[PDB]
Amino acid sequence: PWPASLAALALDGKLRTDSNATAAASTDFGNITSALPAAVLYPSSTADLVALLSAANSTPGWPYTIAFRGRGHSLMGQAFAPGGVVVNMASLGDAAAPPRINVSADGRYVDAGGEQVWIDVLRASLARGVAPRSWTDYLYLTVGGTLSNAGISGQAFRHGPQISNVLEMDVITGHGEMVTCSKQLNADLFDAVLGGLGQFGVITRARIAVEPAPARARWVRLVYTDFAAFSADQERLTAPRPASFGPMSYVEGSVFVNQSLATDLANTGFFTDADVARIVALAGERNATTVYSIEATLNYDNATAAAAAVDQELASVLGTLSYVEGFAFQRDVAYAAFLDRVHGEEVALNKLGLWRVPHPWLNMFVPRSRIADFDRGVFKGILQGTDIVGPLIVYPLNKSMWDDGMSAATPSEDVFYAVSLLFSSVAPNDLARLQEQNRRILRFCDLAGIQYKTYLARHTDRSDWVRHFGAAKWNRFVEMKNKYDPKRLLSPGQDIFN
Numbered sequence: 001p002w003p004a005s006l007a008a009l010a011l012d013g014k015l016r017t018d019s020n021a022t023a024a025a026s027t028d029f030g031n032i033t034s035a036l037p038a039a040v041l042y043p044s045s046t047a048d049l050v051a052l053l054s055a056a057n058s059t060p061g062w063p064y065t066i067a068f069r070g071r072g073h074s075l076m077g078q079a080f081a082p083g084g085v086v087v088n089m090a091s092l093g094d095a096a097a098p099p100r101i102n103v104s105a106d107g108r109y110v111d112a113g114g115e116q117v118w119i120d121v122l123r124a125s126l127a128r129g130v131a132p133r134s135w136t137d138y139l140y141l142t143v144g145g146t147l148s149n150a151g152i153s154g155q156a157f158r159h160g161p162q163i164s165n166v167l168e169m170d171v172i173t174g175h176g177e178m179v180t181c182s183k184q185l186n187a188d189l190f191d192a193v194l195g196g197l198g199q200f201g202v203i204t205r206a207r208i209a210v211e212p213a214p215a216r217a218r219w220v221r222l223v224y225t226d227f228a229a230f231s232a233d234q235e236r237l238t239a240p241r242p243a244s245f246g247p248m249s250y251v252e253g254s255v256f257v258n259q260s261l262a263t264d265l266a267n268t269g270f271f272t273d274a275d276v277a278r279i280v281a282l283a284g285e286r287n288a289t290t291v292y293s294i295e296a297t298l299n300y301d302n303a304t305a306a307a308a309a310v311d312q313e314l315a316s317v318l319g320t321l322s323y324v325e326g327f328a329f330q331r332d333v334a335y336a337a338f339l340d341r342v343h344g345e346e347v348a349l350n351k352l353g354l355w356r357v358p359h360p361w362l363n364m365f366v367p368r369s370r371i372a373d374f375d376r377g378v379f380k381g382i383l384q385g386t387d388i389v390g391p392l393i394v395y396p397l398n399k400s401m402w403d404d405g406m407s408a409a410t411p412s413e414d415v416f417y418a419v420s421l422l423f424s425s426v427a428p429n430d431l432a433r434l435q436e437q438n439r440r441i442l443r444f445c446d447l448a449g450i451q452y453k454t455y456l457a458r459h460t461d462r463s464d465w466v467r468h469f470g471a472a473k474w475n476r477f478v479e480m481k482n483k484y485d486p487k488r489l490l491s492p493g494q495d496i497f498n
C-alpha cells in the first residue's frame, strides 16, 4: 500500500512513469553508462521530498533506490536510480515565487536552493554587489551536486573548495526528516553531507559565504618548457605568506602535448595566431615534447586607480617568476565573463556535435612530492604520440583549506595537485582506447607508489572505496550511513552501498 502523501504526488502528476520522463533521467554527461529508473519525481516543494523519503522509511521492504538529479553532470552514472526513483531537482525552482536564491540583508552570505545552478547564484549575488568566493570552472552545475563532491577551481588554494565555504544547510535525511545543520548544530550531518556523494540525504538549501564583488579580472597566461619551473611557480603563486595568501585571485595551469600544440593553443580562446606561432617556435627551439601554461587572475573593482594598481601589482608578481622571457600574455575582462568562460566552449562544441559525446575524464589529486613523476610517466610518457581532444588541467591546492572531518577525501600531503584530463571521445575506436589509457595511467600511479585520490569517480569494489576514504575515515562514513540512510536507498550510482 501507498501512504496518502506519496499517492498525492502521483495524483498531482509529480510522479511520472512515462518513457519520456524515465529516458531523460537515464543518461548523464559522461555518456558511457545508462540506467532507466522506474519513476521520476518532479517536486514543487521540499514537502514532496519529505513525502517520498518518509514513504521510503515507513514502507517495509521499500525496494526503490532514490537519486537526486541536479543537471546530471556525473561521469559514470552517479545520478541514476536503476529501477528506482530519480528526483528531478530543477522542479523545486519552477514556481519563481518564493525565490530560491536570497542574498542576506548584511551581504555576508547567499541562501540558495540545492537545485539552483551556480550561474544563477552568481547573477543574484552580483545584483546585490556580492559573489561567492570559491567556484567550479563550469557554472551550469547545481549547488547540491558540487557540494556532494567538493567544488574546485583556481580559487580553492586560498578559499578552500566550495565545501569549505558553507555556513549551514537544510537536509532531508533518508528517514525523511528535514534537518538544519552547521558546525554548531547537527555538525555530524553537516560534515557527512559535504563531499558526501548524495549518500545521507538531499540538500534543499545551502548558505554560501560571499565577498564584495570585483568588477574586472586581469587574466594572464605564462608559458614554460620546463615542468620543474612550471610547478615551482604555481606553488610560489599559491603558497601561504608567513592563513594569508598572495595577491592572485585564481591560479590554474594547463599541459599541451607537442603533437597537437598549435591546434590546442588556438582552441584555448586566449591566444592570438601571433601568440600561437611564438609558442610553437619556442617549443621547437627547446625541443619540447610538452609545453606548460600557468593561468592566473587578479580581481579588481571599478575604482579610478584600480587598473594602474593591478598593472603595478602584476608587474611585481611576474618579476618573482621563472616563465620563458617575454612569454606573459594578458587579457582584461568583466568578472562574470571570466567566471562563465567555459559556457562559450559548450555552445561551440555542441554545434559541432562534440558536447553530447562520451567523456572518459580522469580526475585526481596527486601529492606534490610525486607530481614530477606523474608528469614524466603521463604527459611525457603514456599520453605521447596520441591524439588528445580536451584540456589537460594541473594546479596545486593547499590541504590547510580542506576540512578532513568532511566526507571529501584528499592526499595526506600539505600541497597536492588537481589533475583533470578532460578526454572527449570521437569514434567508438576512441572510447575503448581512452578507457584503457585511464586504466594504464592509474596502473602507472599504483606501481610507482603514488598516494593519489580520485575525484568525480565512482569505484566498483568495496576495497577501493575503503582505500579512497582511508580505513578510519571509512568507519565514520559507514557510521553516518547507518544514522542517516539505514535502508541504503540514496544515490545508488556511487556504488558504495549498492
Ligand SMILES: *Cc1cc2c(cc1C)nc1c(=O)[nH]c(=O)nc-1n2C[C@H](O)[C@H](O)[C@H](O)COP(=O)(O)OP(=O)(O)OC[C@H]1O[C@@H](n2cnc3c(N)ncnc32)[C@H](O)[C@@H]1O
Residues within 6 Å of the ligand: 029, 067, 068, 069, 070, 071, 072, 073, 074, 075, 078, 079, 080, 089, 114, 115, 135, 136, 137, 138, 141, 142, 143, 144, 145, 146, 148, 149, 150, 151, 152, 153, 197, 198, 199, 201, 202, 203, 204, 456, 491, 493, 494
Ligand atoms: C559536466 C561538467 C562537470 C564538472 C565541470 C565541468 C563540466 C562540463 N567542472 C568542474 C570543476 O571545475 N570543478 C568541480 O569540482 N567539478 C566539476 N564538474 C563536476 C561537477 O561538480 C559534478 O558533475 C557534480 O555531480 C555536480 O553536477 P550536478 O549538479 O549536475 O549533479 P549530478 O551529476 O546530477 O549529481 C551528482 C551526485 O550528487 C547527488 N546530488 C545532486 N544534487 C543533490 C542535492 N541537492 N543533495 C544531495 N545530493 C545531491 C546525486 O544524487 C548524484 O549522486
Ligand SMILES: *[C@@H]1O[C@H](CO)[C@@H](O[C@@H]2O[C@H](CO)[C@@H](O)[C@H](O)[C@H]2NC(C)=O)[C@H](O)[C@H]1NC(C)=O
Residues within 6 Å of the ligand: 258, 259, 260, 287, 288, 289
Ligand atoms: C612535435 O610534433 C610535430 C608533429 O606534428 C613534429 O614536427 C614534424 O616532424 C616530422 C619528422 O621530422 C616531419 O616529417 C613533419 O613534417 C613535422 N611536422 C610539422 C607540422 O612540423 C616535431 O618533430 C615534434 N617535436 C618533438 C620534440 O617531439
Ligand SMILES: CC(C)=CCNc1ncnc2c1ncn2[C@@H]1O[C@H](CO)[C@@H](O)[C@H]1O
Residues within 6 Å of the ligand: 137, 138, 152, 267, 268, 269, 341, 342, 343, 345, 346, 363, 391, 420, 422
Ligand atoms: C575538475 C573539472 C572536471 C574541471 C572541468 N572544467 C572544465 N570542463 C570543461 N572544460 C573546461 C574546463 N575548464 C576549462 N575548460 C575549457 O578549456 C579551455 C581553457 O583554456 C577552454 O576551451 C575552456 O572552455
Ligand SMILES: *[C@@H]1O[C@H](CO)[C@@H](O)[C@H](O)[C@H]1NC(C)=O
Residues within 6 Å of the ligand: 026, 027, 028, 031, 032, 033, 034, 356, 357
Ligand atoms: C550517448 O549520447 C547519445 C546522443 O544523445 C545517444 O545516442 C546515447 O543513448 C548515449 N549513450 C549512453 C551510454 O548514455
Ligand SMILES: *[C@@H]1O[C@H](CO)[C@@H](O)[C@H](O)[C@H]1NC(C)=O
Residues within 6 Å of the ligand: 287, 289
Ligand atoms: C630532442 O628530443 C627527442 C624526444 O624527446 C630526443 O629523443 C632527441 O634525441 C632530441 N634531440 C636533441 C636534444 O638534439
